[PDB]
């Protein structure tokens, strides 16, 4: 396999005008590696038994040498997984990368859904108040689908049997993801990568050493920022209620999931209908997938350069980004008629921008 | 990779496996060219970055102004107007 | 001595390329000049259309042997 | 596989990937036969 290693990581030729916007695929991969290493290590001392799960995490931190380091690194790195993915996806929408890298885009979307499901499974394991009540709610939005809920839990409620099986699934899915990363890379190197200017060019150079040293430089920043946040606690990435034991007969005063799920949780909150809110979920994913066939939606021949430079009409991806930020604020607020009004305003922009990306 | 009419090779030696990706993207140098490169051990490699700093910074910041900053200021303003109407709506319903 | 490259790319002159590489050497009167003459002979030379009676694949010269056996051709 | 002096092919058509193992064990039918 060493001829494959040198063909794809040493002698592979790349355009000279690459920059840091093309380095975040490597960073995501490295976050998976770090999670697998720290995750397996945590598994040696975790207990899936509901009556003792919450206690096994605390005892791990308070009694075991270096136990605090593996617990806090696993929690912090999870946040960096989703930040890197977000920047990774936004580059593609800025450069219309899916125009000719079609199966790379689709394979990526599957990886995104796999990572969402993995993170949701992991957040239930510590078995605090937010673990229990967040799983109860998010698993009810899927109630319109018949009998899709009572079986995944194996009971009449998020009981102790659900926790045992969420542990096994959480263990397994990341390694399946590693298989799909191989397909992702297959579809990319089939066509070759694009560049920031959106042109064909013969001014290319080998990956090693020029481009390999840019990936290495970015890795340093990632490791330093993870350890900075992990060891000092500068930002508030976790909710305090998950430091409280589960109580099935007392709901917390404010239920909100992790930040990387907040925006779409707000969209589903401002739509009163429960069935209409789930249809909105499918339409959004369908729109992202349809971009793989953007060449065929109009007979005019497209170009990769979108001309956002010095342009006062901006671009649709930029307008989406600010609508997402606006909704993260709404999702973190107490329900109030005024918040609901503006939340619906932003939801329209959040959805319309996706649809018009298929037009040109 | 490259188009078929560009991938055609002039030589006949076989493609070695470590070079499969190189020759999948062969491109003909239409018209020719002359290349000069100096060894990195005989160049100043930090001063050139700062020598051109002002020109590079102008180009980047000028490109991003309209498309990113102008929508950001509008979003910031909407955030303030929203928070000003929430407070007034709480007092028109609960305060006496 | 400047470490540098000067290359003329031309795809309209046949399938054969020509190249030369150089190191900084020593002057006539150097106490090490005789050894440079010898090092030149250890690397040696080779022509595909004039090997002689010793096939290149079984030459005593290691450089010739490695070049002739590359990709079995 | 077979020895080199047996693997040598008479034809020139390229070996297809689904047949890589077949031709790695080619053997000459010394003298011929009728089946």
């Amino acid at each position: 396999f060493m001829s494959l290693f040198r063909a794809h990581l040493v002698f592979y030729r790349c355009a000279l005008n690459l920059n840091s916007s093309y380095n975040f695929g490597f960073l995501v991969a490295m976050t998976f590696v770090l999670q697998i290493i720290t995750g397996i290590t945590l598994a040696f001392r975790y207990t899936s038994e509901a009556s003792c799960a919450f206690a096994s995490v605390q005892h791990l931190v308070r009694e075991v040498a270096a136990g605090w380091e593996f617990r806090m690194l696993h929690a912090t790195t999870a946040s960096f997984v989703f930040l890197c993915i977000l920047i990774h996806m936004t580059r593609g929408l800025y450069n219309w990368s899916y125009s000719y890298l079609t199966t790379a885009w689709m394979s990526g979307l599957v990886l995104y859904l796999l990572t969402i499901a993995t993170a949701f499974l992991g957040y239930v394991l510590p078995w605090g108040q937010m673990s229990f009540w967040g799983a109860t709610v998010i698993t009810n939005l899927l109630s319109p689908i018949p009998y899709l809920v009572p079986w995944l839990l194996g009971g009449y409620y998020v009981s102790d049997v659900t926790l045992k099986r969420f542990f096994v699934l959480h263990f397994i899915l990341p390694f399946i993801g590693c298989i799909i990363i191989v397909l992702h890379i297959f579809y990319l190197h089939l066509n070759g990568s694009s560049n920031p200017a959106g042109i064909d060019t013969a001014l290319k150079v080998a990956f090693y050493p020029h481009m390999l040293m840019t990936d290495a430089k970015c890795l340093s920043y990632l490791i330093g920022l993870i350890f900075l946040q992990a060891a000092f606690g500068l930002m508030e990435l976790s909710h305090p209620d998950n430091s409280i034991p589960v109580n099935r007969f007392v709901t917390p005063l404010h239920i909100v999931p992790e930040w990387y799920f907040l925006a779409y949780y707000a969209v589903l909150k401002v739509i009163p209908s429960k069935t209409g809110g789930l249809l909105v979920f499918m339409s959004s994913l369908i729109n992202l997938g349809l971009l793989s066939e953007i060449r065929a939606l109009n007979t005019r021949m497209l170009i990769r350069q979108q001309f956002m430079t010095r342009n006062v009409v901006s671009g649709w991806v930029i307008i989406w980004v600010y609508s997402m930020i606006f909704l993260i604020i709404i999702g973190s607020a107490i329900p109030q008629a005024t918040y609901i009004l503006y939340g619906r305003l932003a939801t329209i922009l959040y959805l319309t921008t996706g649809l018009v990306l298929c037009l040109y | 990779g490259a188009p078929k009419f560009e991938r055609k090779m002039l030589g006949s030696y076989p493609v070695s496996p470590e070079f499969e990706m190189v020759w999948r993207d062969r491109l003909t140098a239409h018209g020719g060219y002359i290349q000069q490169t100096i060894s990195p051990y005989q160049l100043k490699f930090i001063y050139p970055f700062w020598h051109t700093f002002f020109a590079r910074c102008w180009c980047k910041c000028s490109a991003y102004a309209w498309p990113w900053v102008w929508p950001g200021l509008i979003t910031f303003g909407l955030v303030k107007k929203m928070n000003h109407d929430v407070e007034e709506d709480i007092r028109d319903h609960y305060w006496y | 001595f400047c470490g540098s490259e000067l290359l003329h790319r031309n795809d309209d002159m046949g399938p054969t390329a020509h190249v030369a590489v150089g190191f900084e050497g020593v002057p006539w009167k150097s106490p090490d000049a005789v050894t440079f003459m010898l090092m030149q002979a250890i690397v040696g030379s080779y022509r595909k259309h004039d090997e002689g009676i010793v096939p290149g694949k079984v030459s005593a010269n290691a450089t010739v042997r490695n070049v002739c056996n590359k990709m079995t051709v | 596989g077979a020895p080199k002096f047996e693997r040598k092919m008479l034809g020139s058509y390229p070996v297809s990937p689904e047949f890589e193992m077949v031709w790695r064990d080619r053997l000459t039918a010394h003298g011929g036969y009728i089946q």
Binding site: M2, L4, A7, H189 | - | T72 | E20
Partner: peptide
């Protein structure tokens, strides 16, 4: 083994047809 799988794309080839 460390020189297994020579190519990812294409139709491969035989060393006896070089």
């Amino acid at each position: 083994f460390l020189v297994a799988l020579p190519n990812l794309y294409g139709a491969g080839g035989s060393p006896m047809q070089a």
